[PDB]
């Protein structure tokens, strides 16, 4: 199974200066709770924006760079390497990972930010007439989490006649 894992805002920002725009300490839970002993994949940037591997699940870098290798990370150098790994893969960011795959994916993990922020990476424009709503979710509010946000999971539509 091959899923997108991602936040995005109301205008599907979703990085800056190669950071998260916002600060939601529920949202990272939910990462971790959804690929929890499965597999992330991710560009070079994401990966070095986060700095070290997400322990408990398998983490693999696509890059060009053939000198990189860090310790408790897979490396691969093209997007036909995805489909060679096993088990349930999260594709994980950024923008050109999602560009690459967002028409390859079965379904998206999606948390959308209720918000408007500064961004200069985005997440590629999709619509629900393509897109199932298997769940739709509102986050809870409190003291550390204080942006509205909705936990969607997106299943792709069959194209049937008629
Ligand atoms: N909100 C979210 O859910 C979320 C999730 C993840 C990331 N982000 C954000 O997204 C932004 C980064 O996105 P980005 O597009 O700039 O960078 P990125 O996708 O994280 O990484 C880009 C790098 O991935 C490698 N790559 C991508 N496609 C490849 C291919 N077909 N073959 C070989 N290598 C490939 C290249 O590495 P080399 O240059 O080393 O070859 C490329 O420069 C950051 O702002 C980050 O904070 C947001
Ligand atoms: C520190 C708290 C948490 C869970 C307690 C921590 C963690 C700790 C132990 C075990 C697992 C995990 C999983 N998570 N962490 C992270 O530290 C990574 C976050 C992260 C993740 C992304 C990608 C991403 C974010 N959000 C959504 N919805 N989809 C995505 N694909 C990008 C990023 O920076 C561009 C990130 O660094 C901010």
């Given at each position: 199974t091959?899923?997108?894992?991602?936040?995005?805002?109301?205008?599907?920002?979703?990085?800056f200066?190669?950071?998260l725009?916002?600060?939601?300490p529920?949202?990272?839970?939910?990462?971790?709770?959804?690929?929890?002993?499965?597999?992330?994949?991710?560009?070079?940037?994401?990966?070095?924006?986060?700095?070290?591997?997400?322990?408990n699940?398998?983490?693999?870098?696509?890059?060009?760079?053939?000198?990189?290798?860090?310790?408790?990370?897979?490396?691969?150098?093209?997007?036909?390497?995805?489909?060679?790994?096993?088990?349930?893969?999260?594709?994980?960011?950024?923008?050109?990972?999602?560009?690459?795959?967002?028409?390859?994916?079965?379904?998206?993990?999606?948390?959308?930010?209720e918000?408007?922020?500064?961004?200069?990476?985005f997440?590629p424009?999709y619509?629900?007439?393509?897109?199932?709503?298997?769940?739709?979710?509102?986050?809870?509010?409190?003291?550390?989490?204080?942006?509205?946000?909705?936990?969607?999971?997106?299943?792709?539509?069959?194209?049937?006649?008629?």
């Amino acid at each position: 199974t091959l899923s997108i894992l991602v936040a995005h805002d109301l205008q599907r920002v979703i990085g800056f200066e190669n950071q998260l725009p916002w600060h939601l300490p529920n949202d990272l839970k939910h990462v971790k709770k959804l690929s929890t002993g499965h597999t992330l994949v991710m560009g070079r940037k994401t990966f070095e924006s986060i700095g070290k591997p997400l322990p408990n699940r398998r983490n693999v870098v696509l890059t060009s760079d053939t000198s990189f290798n860090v310790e408790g990370v897979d490396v691969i150098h093209s997007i036909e390497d995805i489909y060679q790994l096993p088990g349930h893969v999260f594709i994980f960011g950024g923008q050109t990972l999602f560009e690459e795959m967002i028409d390859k994916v079965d379904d998206m993990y999606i948390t959308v930010i209720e918000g408007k922020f500064r961004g200069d990476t985005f997440f590629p424009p999709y619509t629900f007439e393509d897109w199932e709503v298997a769940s739709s979710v509102e986050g809870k509010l409190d003291e550390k989490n204080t942006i509205p946000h909705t936990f969607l999971h997106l299943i792709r539509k069959k194209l049937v006649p008629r």
